[PDB]
Amino acid sequence: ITGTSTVGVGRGVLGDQKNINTTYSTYYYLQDNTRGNGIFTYDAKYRTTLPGSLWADADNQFFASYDAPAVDAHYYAGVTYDYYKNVHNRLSYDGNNAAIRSSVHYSQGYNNAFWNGSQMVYGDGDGQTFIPLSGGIDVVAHELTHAVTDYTAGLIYQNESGAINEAISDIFGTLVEFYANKNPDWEIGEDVYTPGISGDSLRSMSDPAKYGDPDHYSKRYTGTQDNGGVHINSGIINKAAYLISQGGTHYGVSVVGIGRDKLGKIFYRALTQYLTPTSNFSQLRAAAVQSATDLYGSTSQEVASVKQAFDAVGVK
Numbered sequence: 001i002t003g004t005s006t007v008g009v010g011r012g013v014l015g016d017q018k019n020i021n022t023t024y025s026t027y028y029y030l031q032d033n034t035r036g037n038g039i040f041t042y043d044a045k046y047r048t049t050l051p052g053s054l055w056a057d058a059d060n061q062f063f064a065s066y067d068a069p070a071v072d073a074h075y076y077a078g079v080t081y082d083y084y085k086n087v088h089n090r091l092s093y094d095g096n097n098a099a100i101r102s103s104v105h106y107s108q109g110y111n112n113a114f115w116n117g118s119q120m121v122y123g124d125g126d127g128q129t130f131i132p133l134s135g136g137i138d139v140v141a142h143e144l145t146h147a148v149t150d151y152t153a154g155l156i157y158q159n160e161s162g163a164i165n166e167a168i169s170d171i172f173g174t175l176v177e178f179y180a181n182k183n184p185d186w187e188i189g190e191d192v193y194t195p196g197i198s199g200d201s202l203r204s205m206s207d208p209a210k211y212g213d214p215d216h217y218s219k220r221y222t223g224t225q226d227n228g229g230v231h232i233n234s235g236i237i238n239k240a241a242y243l244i245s246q247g248g249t250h251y252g253v254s255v256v257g258i259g260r261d262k263l264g265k266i267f268y269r270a271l272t273q274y275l276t277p278t279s280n281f282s283q284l285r286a287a288a289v290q291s292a293t294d295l296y297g298s299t300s301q302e303v304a305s306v307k308q309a310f311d312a313v314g315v316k
Ligand SMILES: CC(C)C[C@H](NP(=O)(O)CNC(=O)OCc1ccccc1)C(=O)N[C@@H](CCCN)C(=O)O
Pocket: 111, 112, 113, 114, 115, 116, 117, 133, 138, 139, 142, 143, 146, 157, 188, 189, 202, 226, 231
């Protein structure tokens, strides 16, 4: 909407106060004009018709329980935009400052979040398995990263290419969580998963097997559930990424860690310069090796560590 840029205040899903960029024109809207061509947050009003209505508020204060998922979807989309711009010189998901749109309060009891080809969508959860999913910064960044992937490598959402697609979203979701630097970890979704159980998460990158996901190519799933295991076999790539950053010895193979920033540079370059819609795990290894060679040199520790990490997870 046309209006003037304003700054509101509210509380997110976990009860934390934050400022949000809004737009005033009769109402205050969740429209942040400070980033690209805008970040826009919508109310889906418990229905499944998208996007719903651009979020409107009478007083620019967002402290109602119903407001909390919108506050966080809006704010964490801004953090994710900032990560891609400041760290990777990427302007929004398409590289040309496309408007970023999210809808919250999607459906009833909906235990998921997704990119629908055009926008982000967040359920409220059923209150037992999940609380409103935009409360997780790793979740929000996971979803926006699907848009980045779709505009760049275009990884098809099935089998090995789809597991790479998933891992890319978990990797950058985690790197955005570290960028914001609030309780960062190598777990996925911990802030919104199972409010009645402490210390768990939906997936682990540091130890995928903790939640039943493979940590070695020999343990990959090859059935048809979950689009051929896209959220299962992602563990193999998530583990490799964790090892590249943090190091470790895994199935007897030692990896010297090179840190999160270099992990992010290598995988961002692989995603945007080398991967294709049908890349498999072996092709990802080659893309990561080439990316690290471009950035750091063929004889570098960074290249050697990429090779060790993929060796450790059984990907040649
Ligand atoms: C980070 C977590 C909290 C959310 C994440 N959701 P996602 O991977 O972005 C779901 N996207 C998806 O399916 O895209 C395909 C598509 C949909 C619509 C239109 C076009 C294409 C996820 O890991 N979901 C799991 C766990 C879900 C537990 N109930 C899961 O779906 O099995």
